[PDB]
């Protein structure tokens, strides 16, 4: 009965660890979209046809998007627990009916 109850708690524990990995990945989904857009802007700016005025105009959206990445990193959270800014570090998720059975999730 102690193992059965600990297995119920372990299933909840694994599900919560799935939730944090899911939310963090969803945030990284927009980090990929923002980065790819910055790559298209960088390629367009490198073209020799552009003059200084247009390169500055492209730089405006580069800086707006770059600030967008930092906002995603600093604001993404799971109930106030910031994930993507590096303060999450390594947290161990207990998946098991007995103590000592946990898996280390690292968010960077």
């Amino acid at each position: 009965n102690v193992q059965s109850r600990g297995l119920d708690v372990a299933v909840r524990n694994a599900n919560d660890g799935i939730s944090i990995a899911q939310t963090a990945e969803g945030a990284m989904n927009e980090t990929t979209n923002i980065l790819q857009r910055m790559r298209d802007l960088s390629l367009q700016s490198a073209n020799g046809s552009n003059s200084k005025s247009e390169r500055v105009a492209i730089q405006e959206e580069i800086t707006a998007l770059n600030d967008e990445l930092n906002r995603i990193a600093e604001t993404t959270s799971f109930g106030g627990n910031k994930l993507l800014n590096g303060t999450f570090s390594t947290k161990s998720f207990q998946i098991g009916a007995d103590n000592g059975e946990a898996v280390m999730l690292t968010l960077k």
Partner: protein, 108 residues
């Protein structure tokens, strides 16, 4: 970083205080009474350039959302109250559970 980025950075780097910016571009910091006792002391170069003045006790009753600054500070204040209510709901939940165990024991 612009001032609104300093505010979001401080938010992600700690949970003891909550930073914001009002209509005049002044950085507000709110230390809830559920997390911090006494007075908060500010130092460093950034605080030297952002003289933080003295602290004023704010509660839910004194919330005034008629300004950008008042609204931001009221989000933090309402969060302190929400933690306060949840905490007491957990003390009453533990009390009820312990009294259900007591009833079962007395029946035996």
């Amino acid at each position: 970083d612009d001032i609104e980025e300093v505010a979001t950075y401080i938010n992600g780097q700690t949970d003891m205080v909550k930073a914001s910016v009002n209509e005049k571009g002044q950085l507000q910091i709110f230390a809830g009474n559920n997390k911090v006792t006494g007075d908060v002391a500010f130092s460093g170069g950034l605080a030297g350039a952002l003289n933080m003045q003295a602290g004023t006790a704010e509660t839910v009753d004194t919330i005034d959302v008629t300004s950008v600054g008042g609204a931001q500070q009221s989000v933090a204040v309402i969060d302190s109250a929400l933690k306060y209510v949840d905490s007491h709901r957990a003390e009453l939940g533990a009390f009820q559970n312990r009294f259900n165990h007591a009833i079962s024991n007395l029946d035996n």
